[PDB]
Design a binder for this molecule. Structure first.
Ligand SMILES: *[C@@H]1O[C@H](CO)[C@@H](O[C@@H]2O[C@H](CO)[C@@H](O)[C@H](O)[C@H]2NC(C)=O)[C@H](O)[C@H]1NC(C)=O
Ligand code: NAG
Ligand code: NAG
Ligand code: NAG
Ligand code: NAG
Ligand code: NAG
Ligand code: NAG
Ligand code: NAG
Ligand code: NAG
Ligand code: NAG
Ligand code: NAG
Ligand code: NAG
Lengths: 290, 270, 49, 49, 49, 49
């Protein structure tokens, strides 16, 4: 990196160079500053109302909530909660602080201890077939923790229900709350239950003195997509003033890169945020602020 | 709950090179791009449904829903006002309702016990000219509701029953992974019959997280009546003029052209 | 998982991004070698002419 | 014939430091490719001669 | 006979049994057994049916 | 794990199968490329003759 002659020596892999023209690599420019551009978001995200709720939903009628206008600073949970299972699928955990999420959804329910392994793509079983299913190409995170001190009663809590019989398996992210009569044998059930007719719902029997495999667990699943579809939930990073006409390192809503920024004459439709070139490379981007 | 249904065999037609929607939300300019997805094949069989009275044609049947659907409405007055989606259309399964009642557009997901022939109704008065939507019969009860959305209030004209059709509306409905996707488009048009050939984009409208099983759907219509024979059932109605066409989607590979301004302009069915 | 290095470097840590980066490197090297071979053959024809 | 030159790191990695630190293991390939392309270019000027 | 047996063998003298002429419908174990560990190696579980 | 698409599609779900399919795709593309290159060289020789 000293002189062009030294560069030619390095490229040729020798110490002596004869006479020639010896084309070198190129003209390269390094950046000077690093800039960050995040939207104007101030309110903390309602972690308490989701995780620290007074009650959850039954597994067959699982609950879904929409999350928007948040600052995803999950350090606040460090003193109040302890999670037994936490696994993400589309991202690496260490990057969760340098991204903005677009269409966040939170799913909540409660299951038995020995069934947390079934909340994963490609699994099979009672929960994975009749109650709750995940798509093959899932992008999100799964969190599960023990809740013995809350969802267990001395006489036995009979408020949480689960389905036991179904004619066919579910499709991903589908709900079923029908309470008909399941026919197992051959004689039609024609209403009332009988010898080969069953009520398809049964209640979990939760006692404070059961084994660890029979104790209740609370499960929350977070689903989102990352780059396209301009985002609304963002992580805890500080924005900096925009620098243009110079080569810099830029982080726009989680997209990182290096280059020079100039004004453009393009006009985006209201639902578009990024614009790419012919060879699938990002060349145009809107600005969160201004 | 309705009579006076003079009948005749249904009609048929084809579709032009229309029914193309944006597949993503990324800006592209002056490009030729190849994509395989669920689309409406060019020159496809399409059924035709009338609503008029010289005949007393009303035409609100139950049609199968499979792999999404494409719905085109040609009208001069607001008659087609929503849809009902479900699997059995009974009280033992969940169902989806989208309907506009001249003040709000409402989307609901409940355990509806639907009527055999639901509709809305407007009444025309004498001397003091007015129309104040004096009829609404869509369902009997709704117990367990998980999704609900109501829009801001507004108002719309109600009679407009002169000339020929002057409004065209395009809708595409899909159901994937518990998401109900609706794409929409609007266009002024002057015609008499036989939906015009042409090309138009179908910019995304909404994605709803309903998470239900859908196999069949039915159309919601509004009839306007005035001083006529009484006895609603055989009492006359004066549904003026409207038409709706239905097509079915299939998986196909298409080629799309993105313009200089980022607008889809032409497509080719491989 | 993607054709853009920026997306991979933004969503994944180095140990997991290395695999996709290697796949892209191999593909692009193969493309360059194919181009070079075709250029050599065309050059031979031009030399004969 | 047209004379062409190719830069690996700009085509493959394209202004990235996480990349171009992995091309070193494949580096000996690029020096080969250029020795082909250069061999074509010098030849062209001979043809006109 | 297999899962709901009154006695199991010691680990060193582990027991082996032959299975033939079945209709392997494992859906009948849902209301009686809860499994802590279940891992398949040569196939995907969803294809077992 | 196998040279037949049907076996892989019968024993594995899609998210575990695209990898094997990708390996097979790359191998067969390489085979076709080699065939085309040899054909080009033979065509040049026949052109000279
Ligand atoms: C159309 O249907 C909607 C569905 O609710 C009606 O909405 C009302 O909205 C007001 C204001 O939010 C509420 O206080 C009422 O409880 C809602 N229900 C009704 C039936 O009044 C709306 O009024 C309907 N419009 C017409 C013309 O019937
Ligand atoms: C969190 O839950 C506990 C119950 O253990 C309750 O006492 C506390 O008030 C809750 N705090 C918030 C912020 O919801
Ligand atoms: C953290 O939680 C413990 C609970 O024992 C409490 O004593 C402590 O004050 C808490 N600290 C903060 C900073 O919330
Ligand atoms: C959806 O409904 C149809 C019609 O009742 C039924 O055949 C099908 O099995 C249902 N799908 C699921 C996943 O249960
Ligand atoms: C965002 O905040 C900045 C603070 O400097 C302000 O200048 C800008 O107008 C704000 N924009 C929006 C859209 O809130
Ligand atoms: C499609 O319909 C138009 C007008 O109805 C007609 O002119 C044309 O011949 C039709 N094409 C086919 C292939 O049926
Ligand atoms: C559409 O289907 C009907 C029903 O079989 C048939 O009579 C008609 O010819 C078909 N039209 C076209 C254009 O395929
Ligand atoms: C028009 O008159 C009818 C009865 O003749 C009345 O019901 C209606 O409210 C009137 N409309 C107005 C005053 O806008
Ligand atoms: C559905 O409605 C019935 C009728 O009241 C009720 O008994 C049942 O609990 C409801 N199911 C829910 C809310 O999940
Ligand atoms: C883009 O839209 C403008 C609107 O003023 C129009 O003048 C221009 O021709 C359009 N560019 C195209 C169609 O390539
Ligand atoms: C398992 O064996 C025991 C033996 O006492 C019996 O009581 C029980 O019903 C059996 N369970 C099943 C599911 O066969
Ligand atoms: C399922 O197991 C529970 C718990 O022992 C029992 O009460 C119920 O009768 C069983 N159902 C069937 C259909 O055997």
């Amino acid at each position: 990196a000293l002189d062009p002659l030294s560069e030619t020596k390095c490229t040729l892999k020798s110490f002596t160079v004869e006479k020639g023209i010896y084309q070198t690599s190129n003209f390269r420019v390094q950046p000077t500053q690093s800039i960050v551009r995040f939207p104007n978001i101030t309110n903390l995200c309602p972690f308490g109302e989701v995780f620290n709720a007074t009650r959850f939903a039954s597994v067959y009628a699982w609950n879904r909530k929409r999350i928007s206008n948040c600052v995803a600073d999950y350090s606040v949970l460090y003193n109040s909660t302890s999670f037994s299972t936490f696994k993400c699928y589309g991202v690496s955990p260490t990057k969760l602080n340098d991204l903005c999420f677009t269409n966040v959804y939170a799913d909540s329910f409660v299951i038995r201890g020995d069934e947390v392994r079934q909340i994963a793509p490609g699994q099979t079983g009672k929960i994975a077939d009749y109650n709750y299913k995940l798509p093959d190409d899932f992008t999100g995170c799964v969190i599960a923790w023990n809740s013995n001190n809350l969802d267990s009663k001395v006489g036995g809590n009979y408020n949480y229900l689960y389905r036991l019989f179904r004619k066919s398996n579910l499709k991903p992210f589908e709900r079923d709350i029908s309470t008909e009569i399941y026919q197992a044998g051959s004689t039609p059930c024609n209403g009332v239950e009988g010898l080969n007719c069953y009520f398809p719902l049964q209640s979990y029997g939760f006692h404070p003195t059961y084994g660890v495999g029979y104790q209740p667990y609370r499960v929350v699943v977070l689903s989102f997509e990352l780059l396209n579809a301009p985002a609304t939930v963002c992580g805890p990073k500080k924005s900096t003033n925009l620098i243009k006409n110079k080569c810099v390192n830029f982080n726009f809503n989680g997209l990182t890169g290096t280059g020079v920024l100039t004004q453009s004459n393009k006009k985006f439709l209201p639902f578009q945020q990024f614009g790419r070139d012919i060879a699938d490379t990002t060349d145009a981007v809107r600005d969160p602020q201004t | 709950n309705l009579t006076t249904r003079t009948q005749l065999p249904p009609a048929y037609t084809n579709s032009s090179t229309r029914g193309v929607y944006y597949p993503d939300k990324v800006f592209r300019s002056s490009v030729l791009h190849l994509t395989q997805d669920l689309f409406l094949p060019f020159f496809s069989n399409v059924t035709w449904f009338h609503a008029l009275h010289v005949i007393k044609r009303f035409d609100n049947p139950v049609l199968p829903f499979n792999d999404g659907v494409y719905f085109a409405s040609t009208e001069k007055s607001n008659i087609i006002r929503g849809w009902i989606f479900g699997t059995t259309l009974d009280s033992k399964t969940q169902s989806l309702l989208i309907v506009n009642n001249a003040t709000n557009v409402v989307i609901k997901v409940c355990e509806f016990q639907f009527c055999n022939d639901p509709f809305l109704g407007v009444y025309y008065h004498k001397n003091n000219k007015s129309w104040m939507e004096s009829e609404f019969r869509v369902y009997s009860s709704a117990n367990n509701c998980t999704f609900e959305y109501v829009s801001q209030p507004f108002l719309i004209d109600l009679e407009g029953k002169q000339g020929n059709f002057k409004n065209l509306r395009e809708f595409v409905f899909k159901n994937i992974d518990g998401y109900f996707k609706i794409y929409s488009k609007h266009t002024p048009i002057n015609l008499v019959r036989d939906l015009p050939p042409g090309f138009s984009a179908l910019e995304p409208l909404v994605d709803l997280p309903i998470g239900i099983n859908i196999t069949r759907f039915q159309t919601l219509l509004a009839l306007h009546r005035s001083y006529l024979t009484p006895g609603d059932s055989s009492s006359g109605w004066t549904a003026g003029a409207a038409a709706y066409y239905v097509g079915y989607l299939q998986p196909r590979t298409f080629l799309l052209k993105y313009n200089e301004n980022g607008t889809i302009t032409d497509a080719v069915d491989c | 998982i993607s054709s853009v290095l920026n997306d991979i470097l933004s969503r994944l840590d180095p140990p997991e991004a290395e695999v996709q980066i290697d796949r892209l490197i191999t593909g692009r090297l193969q493309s360059l070698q194919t181009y070079v071979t075709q250029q050599l053959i065309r050059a031979a024809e031009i030399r004969a002419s | 014939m047209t004379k062409t030159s190719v830069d690996c790191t700009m085509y493959i990695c394209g202004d990235s430091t996480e990349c171009s630190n992995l091309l070193l293991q494949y580096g000996s390939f690029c020096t080969q490719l250029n020795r082909a392309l250069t061999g074509i270019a010098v030849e062209q000027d001979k043809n006109t001669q």
